[PDB]
Amino acid sequence: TSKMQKIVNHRAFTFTVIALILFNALIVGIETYPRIYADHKWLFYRIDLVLLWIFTIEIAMRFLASNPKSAFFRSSWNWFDFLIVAAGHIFAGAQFVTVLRILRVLRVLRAISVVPSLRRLVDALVMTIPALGNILILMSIFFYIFAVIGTMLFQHVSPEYFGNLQLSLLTLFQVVTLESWASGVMRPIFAEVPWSWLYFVSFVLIGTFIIFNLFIGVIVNNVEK
Amino acid sequence: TSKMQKIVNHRAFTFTVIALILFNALIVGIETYPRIYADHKWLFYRIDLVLLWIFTIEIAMRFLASNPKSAFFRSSWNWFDFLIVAAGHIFAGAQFVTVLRILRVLRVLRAISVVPSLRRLVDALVMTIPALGNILILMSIFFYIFAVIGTMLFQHVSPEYFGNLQLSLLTLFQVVTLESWASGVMRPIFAEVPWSWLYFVSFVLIGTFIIFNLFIGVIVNNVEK
Amino acid sequence: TSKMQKIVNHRAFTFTVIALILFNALIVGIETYPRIYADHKWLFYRIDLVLLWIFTIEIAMRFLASNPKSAFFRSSWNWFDFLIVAAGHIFAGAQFVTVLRILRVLRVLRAISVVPSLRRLVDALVMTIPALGNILILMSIFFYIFAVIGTMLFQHVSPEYFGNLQLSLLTLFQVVTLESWASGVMRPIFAEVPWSWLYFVSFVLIGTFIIFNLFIGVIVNNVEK
Amino acid sequence: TSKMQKIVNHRAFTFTVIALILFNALIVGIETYPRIYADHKWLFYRIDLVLLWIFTIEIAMRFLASNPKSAFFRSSWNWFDFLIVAAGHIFAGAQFVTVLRILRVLRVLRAISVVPSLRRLVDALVMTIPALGNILILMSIFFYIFAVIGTMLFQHVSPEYFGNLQLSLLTLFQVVTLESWASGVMRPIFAEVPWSWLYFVSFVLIGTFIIFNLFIGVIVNNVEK
Numbered sequence A, B, C, D: 001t002s003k004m005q006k007i008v009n010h011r012a013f014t015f016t017v018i019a020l021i022l023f024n025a026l027i028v029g030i031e032t033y034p035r036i037y038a039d040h041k042w043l044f045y046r047i048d049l050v051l052l053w054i055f056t057i058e059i060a061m062r063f064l065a066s067n068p069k070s071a072f073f074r075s076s077w078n079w080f081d082f083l084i085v086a087a088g089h090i091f092a093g094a095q096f097v098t099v100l101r102i103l104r105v106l107r108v109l110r111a112i113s114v115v116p117s118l119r120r121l122v123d124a125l126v127m128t129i130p131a132l133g134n135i136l137i138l139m140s141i142f143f144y145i146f147a148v149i150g151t152m153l154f155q156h157v158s159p160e161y162f163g164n165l166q167l168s169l170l171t172l173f174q175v176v177t178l179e180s181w182a183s184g185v186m187r188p189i190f191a192e193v194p195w196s197w198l199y200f201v202s203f204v205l206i207g208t209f210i211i212f213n214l215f216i217g218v219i220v221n222n223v224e225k
């Protein structure tokens, strides 16, 4: 025999939850001001516990009235909600307290799934990645090749930018965004090894011919259907 | 009984007004040269008063011959004109005189509405925002989440960029435009907290995957109809 | 009675001219090396005179066999060629010799019109400006408004960037390209007048919402037909 | 009489080769850590020789069972593979050893052709260049003209940026990407020769009106068919 499955889908419930979130998006933006932080310390503690408990019972009521161990877990969205709330209860203890606050901010991130207009949008934004699934592998192979070539070439001439396979993977990401790729990344080096203009000029051409052909691929694909 | 509603829509009136504006766009660009400013001081005063009065009577003649208290106020454009001119008469006094000059420059902005070719264009440019009304909320939620996370993480390590919820909202806007996001914003910080490359690299990827999907959304939408 | 109009349109003539240009594109790129410049001085003088004369007779033969004072001047392209060559003969004298060399380089620019594949392309690229003829006026009005507002606001706080109506028109062009608009242009100023983040943030949003709507306008228009 | 042409196209062969490559993409990324490099020196030597030999016999088996001296060489892809492997055997000697390592990294680049999903993609990405074959010539002519004009104009005022026809060809490439084109490239110069704002402002407008019309050309072309 069923039960109160007719109120969790009521319109006087979504608005309650969004009001709660928006209040939590404010109580967590406010507590970044040390002045008002210490002045109302041990109040944020309580109100955080309250909001956490309300959210916990909230997902609970959204679980019982949704085909128990059947469909509630068949969706990714429900898993996202339950994951955050459970993560709230998990880390609550004498630990690296800082990782507890980021979870509160992510609670405000949950406002994406309780606004049916946004949930559908982010679904559309996520189900376009499988389309550009090959260009991304081709972009990763070239990122890797250049990250190895740059490391074994500019290791003892600029250890800040090309020091290891990771620092030189970061330098290669600053350059695809064309951020100081020449004034800072490539001018000092091109003074030591003069044939190095070939590395950066060939990378900026290839790495930008692939990016613009990913962008065009999405334009064509989305317009197609 | 009607009156001279047949001259405000005459073509020998729009050209008069545009001539007046273009003259005011010149008399206000010229007065930014202190040399010629002081040398012809107390002349700009008079000519400003003249232009203001002509503009005032101008909107008046555009009001009486346009269904009195009926349609003249039903449009946004007419409200824009009347608002500027009234703002001219409002602030004229012994006050922060500098806020009076900006109103003159905005008088030249009014040239958008008296050129029927431009008015229609800006109407089309404004009535495309409701289309991208969801992507903007999704972009604002992520701006806010990252502005709070960055503030409560990089507060005592770079107070210039992430000092409060607002300074760190400005830093996060410089980074979406990819302006010195790594050379200046993220290199000094990544030296203090080494795991911070995750903050900026994840933000530049997410915040740019949303922007390019807003741009594509507009391309698809406008091409659609 | 007609004459040799059947050789200027011969295919053994375009190739001669392109060979000449490509040789002039080399003789003018080579003379920028002072070493080989002085070492073969007074040779470049002669060969320049030769090439100039050949080009002059070349347009002459392209003039006589093309409906004398009828259609030869009805086209813009022919005017472009004749203008450059005449400009070559005009400035040749005891003058600011430097303005003579730029004319040689522009002779190599003439290679656009003698390659029928390029001439058609640049025609298509030029006859799309009348399409975006309104967005450009709307972009110019906003450039001007902000150039005046910035000048009468940031004149005595950063005379390098906003000194007059022109220096502040240049600063406003560096910012639409998002080049150091915050690290260099807006950070020093935002320290003097704190409410100035409104100027640059509002300009970067408006000036980029118009540019992307010009780009989209061209995409839609060109795809349309 | 034919032979074992039925195993090189077996699906238990492509996976073997990709496993080998992915292992070589790891053995070459790992050897950029000097710590683990010297500690396991003279082991990388052996394993490199092994992988090289396996790859050599691998292309050999892909050659014999593919119409001997007929079609194996009619394709560009097969030439690419054989070229890399032969280049591996070629340079192996008492020479500039550094050019030997880059060949290993390029062996991992070969993973593009043995993944039928990628090979087709890169074919599509390469057969779109003939489409934009005219815009590229028009872009090269303007790059060259400006590279000569800038060199013969800003030679003795900024020898770092415009020193010769090549250094000024590099400066002109940093500017089309809008990287520090004003803060670094054009501000110091505009202080010496004041009319030089014309060079950079006219170049950034022309060189960006051509790039955006190349991008649009590809959008239109790819959407067309």
Ligand SMILES: CCCCCCCC/C=C/CCCCCCCC(=O)O[C@@H](COC(=O)CCCCCCCCCCCCCCC)COP(=O)([O-])OCC[N+](C)(C)C
Pocket: A137, A140, A141, A143, A144, A165, A166, A169, D025, D026, D029, D030, D033, D035, D036, D111
């Ligand atoms: C279908 C084809 C797919 C093509 C993809 C190719 C993928 C091929 C994958 C290749 C794998 C790369 C080789 C891994 C080498 C790590 C081993 C190592 O040396 O660790 C070092 C530590 O240093 C570290 O801290 C580890 C850092 C991890 C490197 C991350 C690079 C991942 C590249 C991903 C590229 C993705 C693309 C990038 C853009 C997204 C240890 O050495 P040590 O410093 O001397 O310290 C002493 C040892 N100790 C620590 C035990 C005491």
Ligand SMILES: CCCCCCCC/C=C/CCCCCCCC(=O)O[C@@H](COC(=O)CCCCCCCCCCCCCCC)COP(=O)([O-])OCC[N+](C)(C)C
Pocket: A025, A026, A029, A030, A033, A035, A036, A111, B137, B140, B141, B143, B144, B165, B166, B169
């Ligand atoms: C559908 C879901 C929507 C999601 C949207 C989520 C929106 C949720 C909204 C969240 C609201 C954010 C919390 C506001 C906290 C202000 C209170 C405060 O502490 O003031 C401080 C002053 O400091 C100031 O000067 C006030 C500055 C206003 C902050 C502007 C951030 C707005 C974020 C908008 C984000 C938009 C996105 C950004 C990109 C566009 C006072 O503290 P004090 O300094 O110690 O001074 C002593 C007090 N005294 C001054 C009285 C003497």
Ligand SMILES: CCCCCCCC/C=C/CCCCCCCC(=O)O[C@@H](COC(=O)CCCCCCCCCCCCCCC)COP(=O)([O-])OCC[N+](C)(C)C
Pocket: B025, B026, B029, B030, B033, B035, B036, B111, C137, C140, C141, C143, C144, C165, C166, C169
């Ligand atoms: C349909 C609606 C259209 C809307 C468009 C609005 C256009 C409205 C047009 C407005 C015109 C702007 C006012 C001109 C003022 C110049 C007078 C002056 O003071 O000269 C000064 C010299 O300084 C100079 O060297 C002159 C520099 C010319 C300014 C170029 C700005 C053009 C703006 C174009 C904007 C285009 C957009 C920008 C983006 C493309 C003289 O003063 P002085 O220094 O003290 O020297 C002593 C005098 N002496 C030199 C004689 C001895």
Ligand SMILES: CCCCCCCC/C=C/CCCCCCCC(=O)O[C@@H](COC(=O)CCCCCCCCCCCCCCC)COP(=O)([O-])OCC[N+](C)(C)C
Pocket: C025, C026, C029, C030, C033, C035, C036, C111, D137, D140, D141, D143, D144, D165, D166, D169
């Ligand atoms: C259809 C129409 C097509 C239009 C295209 C137009 C193409 C027209 C082509 C024009 C060719 C350009 C002229 C070449 C001049 C080199 C001669 C020289 O002086 O060498 C100097 C060395 O300096 C060097 O090291 C050589 C560097 C090569 C210059 C590369 C520019 C290529 C431009 C490509 C532009 C492509 C576009 C750019 C963007 C991709 C020698 O002089 P020196 O220093 O005093 O040393 C003493 C001599 N010594 C060394 C023997 C001892």
Ligand SMILES: CCCCCCCC/C=C\CCCCCCCC(=O)O[C@@H](COC(=O)CCCCCCCCCCCCCCC)COP(=O)([O-])OCC[N+](C)(C)C
Pocket: A190, A191, A192, A193, A194, A195, A197, A198, A201, A202, D136, D139, D140, D143, D166, D167, D169, D170, D173
């Ligand atoms: C990868 C693509 C290449 C393109 C080829 C183009 C032509 C190839 C041009 C030149 C090739 C040969 C150069 C001769 C000298 C080489 C060695 C050298 O010494 O370097 C010298 C110059 O070298 C440069 O500065 C490179 C010039 C930049 C070319 C950028 C082209 C942008 C393409 C635009 C794309 C748009 C169009 C799209 C069309 C694709 C510098 O060293 P140095 O002078 O000896 O000084 C001493 C060392 N010191 C610095 C420490 C003091």
Ligand SMILES: CCCCCCCC/C=C\CCCCCCCC(=O)O[C@@H](COC(=O)CCCCCCCCCCCCCCC)COP(=O)([O-])OCC[N+](C)(C)C
Pocket: A136, A139, A140, A143, A166, A167, A169, A170, A173, B190, B191, B192, B194, B195, B197, B198, B201, B202
């Ligand atoms: C968010 C997405 C991640 C992507 C994962 C990719 C693989 C993940 C790779 C590495 C992951 C693990 C790194 C091992 C070390 C971590 C901790 C650390 O010490 O940092 C170290 C290095 O760390 C880096 O520099 C990060 C490398 C930049 C990766 C950028 C990938 C760009 C994606 C391209 C997108 C295009 C393709 C699109 C495909 C999506 C730095 O610290 P340190 O060495 O100890 O030095 C001491 C501290 N000190 C600096 C103060 C002196």
Ligand SMILES: CCCCCCCC/C=C\CCCCCCCC(=O)O[C@@H](COC(=O)CCCCCCCCCCCCCCC)COP(=O)([O-])OCC[N+](C)(C)C
Pocket: B136, B139, B140, B143, B166, B167, B169, B170, B173, C190, C191, C192, C194, C195, C197, C198, C201, C202
């Ligand atoms: C134009 C659009 C506005 C947007 C409104 C957004 C919310 C409005 C937020 C705040 C509004 C009110 C701010 C309170 C303080 C104002 C006065 C002040 O003192 O400034 C202070 C902070 O001020 C800032 O730093 C501005 C924050 C940048 C907002 C950028 C939003 C990016 C939009 C993203 C677009 C993507 C989404 C698209 C959606 C459109 C700085 O001064 P101070 O702290 O007193 O320090 C002393 C002075 N000193 C610096 C010299 C030492």
Ligand SMILES: CCCCCCCC/C=C\CCCCCCCC(=O)O[C@@H](COC(=O)CCCCCCCCCCCCCCC)COP(=O)([O-])OCC[N+](C)(C)C
Pocket: C136, C139, C140, C143, C166, C167, C169, C170, C173, D190, D191, D192, D194, D195, D197, D198, D201, D202
């Ligand atoms: C190529 C296109 C041009 C556009 C024309 C626009 C109007 C033309 C405007 C002015 C033209 C005439 C200027 C008068 C002075 C010239 C000589 C001079 O002295 O320079 C002076 C100022 O000069 C500038 O700063 C130039 C202003 C930048 C205009 C950028 C327009 C951006 C177009 C936006 C595109 C978007 C819209 C698209 C529409 C296309 C500087 O020298 P000085 O003051 O004597 O100082 C002493 C020297 N010192 C510096 C070493 C100390």
Ligand code: NA
Pocket: A177, A178, B177, B178, C177, C178, D177, D178
């Ligand atoms: Na940029």
Ligand code: NA
Pocket: A178, A179, A180, B178, B179, B180, C178, C179, C180, D178, D179, D180
């Ligand atoms: Na930059």
